[PDB]
Amino acid sequence: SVKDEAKISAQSFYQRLLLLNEEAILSGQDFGVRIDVDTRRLTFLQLTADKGWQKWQNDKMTNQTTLKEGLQLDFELGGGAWQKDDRLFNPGSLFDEEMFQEPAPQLFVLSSGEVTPFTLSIFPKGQEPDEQWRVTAQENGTLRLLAPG
Amino acid sequence: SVKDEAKISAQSFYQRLLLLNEEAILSGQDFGVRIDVDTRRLTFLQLTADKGWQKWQNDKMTNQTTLKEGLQLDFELGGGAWQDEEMFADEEPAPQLFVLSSGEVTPFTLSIFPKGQEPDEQWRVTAQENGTLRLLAPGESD
Ligand SMILES: [Cl-]
Ligand code: NA
Ligand code: NA
């Protein structure tokens, strides 16, 4: 069911975030996660001096995931408000093609082991983001997967 | 004169960039420079997890340079071309130049020159693909 999907999607994010935190610490390089609430996408990025933020091409994990239809995602930075607006959809984000330089991650996963404080929640369409399957960090890199409630 | 000012500014940016790279390496933290061509500003930033890029508050160098009004700046990257009231009282743009803890610096050239001249072959600071940082006088070096 969609609730079962939400769990699996939260475990997938947790595993990927842990992996990137581990990669940063072992490699001395900085990584990041870009969350796109309107397209329900998470992209896993590496910072290089010569090309800035790029998708991380690697032999451990895919670098972009998109939620299955029927799931939503949302996120908070630090103590702040949920990021997603109330619209059912962003009229501009429906278009696969440009209508009118990899965008920077909101979550930094630094070589020091520090991670941007945040909460990402994943939940069935029709529900609010609060008290859902969620992954949270704090600044020191401590990271939690939390069940609804 | 304005040409003497260009030199002094180029020399100062080299010194500040060298310190930033040295600090990145020594400290394991990431830094960067943001260049604002229109306003003639160079801003020296630090990457933190919790606040992203922010001005580098430190006790050794200033973290924002604004060139004197008779001067102009431009930069190229690698082989590219020249570039409300609150209800209760108690209710940073990214750098183009990354100065990473690995010691690597975004390949670039910044040139500083009297207002309205061409940016080529001016007092300049370059970070080459090699890793090296160079201060170069006007004209092509030997
Ligand atoms: Cl400077
Ligand atoms: Na994304
Ligand atoms: Na990319």
Side-chain angles (χ1 to χ4, degrees), chain A residues 1-68 70-99 102-149, chain B residues 1-90 92-128 130-141:
Chain A
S1 63
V2 183
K3 305 178 195 277
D4 293 316
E5 295 170 5
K7 181 168 172 182
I8 287 177
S9 291
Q11 288 187 323
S12 158
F13 177 73
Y14 178 73
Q15 296 175 334
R16 291 153 178 284
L17 178 63
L18 278 196
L19 194 152
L20 267 187
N21 172 58
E22 179 175 27
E23 197 72 19
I25 286 157
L26 287 160
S27 70
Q29 300 305 310
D30 289 345
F31 297 88
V33 174
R34 191 174 70 245
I35 307 168
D36 295 315
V37 293
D38 298 338
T39 56
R40 307 167 301 105
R41 200 166 307 154
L42 296 164
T43 305
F44 300 96
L45 303 168
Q46 186 184 29
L47 178 57
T48 56
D50 58 335
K51 299 179 269 279
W53 296 103
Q54 299 289 333
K55 299 178 182 172
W56 182 37
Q57 305 204 45
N58 71 92
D59 70 350
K60 297 181 163 184
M61 70 178 211
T62 54
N63 61 43
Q64 198 162 243
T65 60
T66 304
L67 298 178
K68 272 180 339 307
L71 297 172
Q72 301 283 33
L73 55 80
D74 207 350
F75 75 109
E76 290 164 329
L77 302 173
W82 295 105
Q83 294 266 347
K84 188 170 192 199
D85 64 55
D86 280 347
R87 293 178 294 180
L88 305 190
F89 63 86
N90 177 340
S93 84
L94 296 204
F95 302 90
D96 297 353
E97 304 283 318
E98 182 56 73
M99 290 295 104
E102 194 64 57
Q106 303 97 335
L107 315 180
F108 308 102
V109 180
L110 308 180
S111 61
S112 61
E114 301 223 326
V115 171
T116 306
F118 76 95
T119 296
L120 177 92
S121 79
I122 299 167
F123 53 94
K125 188 180 309 166
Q127 289 177 39
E128 296 293 351
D130 312 273
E131 286 211 295
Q132 293 291 355
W133 278 105
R134 62 198 181 278
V135 174
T136 63
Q138 249 269 42
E139 191 193 327
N140 72 0
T142 291
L143 278 7
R144 284 261 266 180
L145 173 65
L146 304 147
Chain B
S1 89
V2 55
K3 91 174 66 167
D4 304 304
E5 293 170 20
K7 181 182 184 174
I8 281 168
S9 290
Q11 290 178 323
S12 302
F13 177 73
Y14 167 76
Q15 291 174 303
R16 289 191 176 95
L17 179 59
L18 269 185
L19 177 54
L20 213 61
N21 171 69
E22 173 181 26
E23 178 68 349
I25 285 153
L26 286 164
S27 69
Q29 309 290 335
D30 281 0
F31 295 87
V33 184
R34 188 174 75 250
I35 302 154
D36 295 318
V37 165
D38 64 330
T39 57
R40 321 180 300 281
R41 255 147 76 224
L42 299 174
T43 298
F44 304 88
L45 301 172
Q46 174 191 4
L47 182 54
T48 58
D50 52 317
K51 283 203 78 66
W53 287 106
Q54 297 296 336
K55 290 177 171 79
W56 180 30
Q57 297 189 273
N58 73 99
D59 70 1
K60 189 166 183 71
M61 77 181 214
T62 52
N63 59 42
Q64 192 160 249
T65 287
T66 300
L67 298 189
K68 299 178 155 93
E69 53 158 68
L71 296 166
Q72 195 167 339
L73 60 74
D74 212 336
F75 69 100
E76 36 187 35
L77 305 166
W82 299 106
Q83 287 281 316
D84 290 8
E85 197 179 1
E86 297 281 2
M87 304 296 109
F88 295 94
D90 65 6
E92 190 79 52
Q96 301 97 339
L97 305 183
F98 299 105
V99 182
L100 302 182
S101 60
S102 51
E104 296 166 78
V105 174
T106 301
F108 75 97
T109 298
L110 171 85
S111 84
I112 298 170
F113 47 93
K115 176 184 95 174
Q117 299 190 5
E118 283 306 313
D120 319 83
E121 288 201 302
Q122 291 290 359
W123 280 103
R124 69 199 173 270
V125 179
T126 185
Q128 303 182 60
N130 203 14
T132 188
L133 303 204
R134 286 299 143 243
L135 176 61
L136 302 194
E140 53 202 286
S141 61

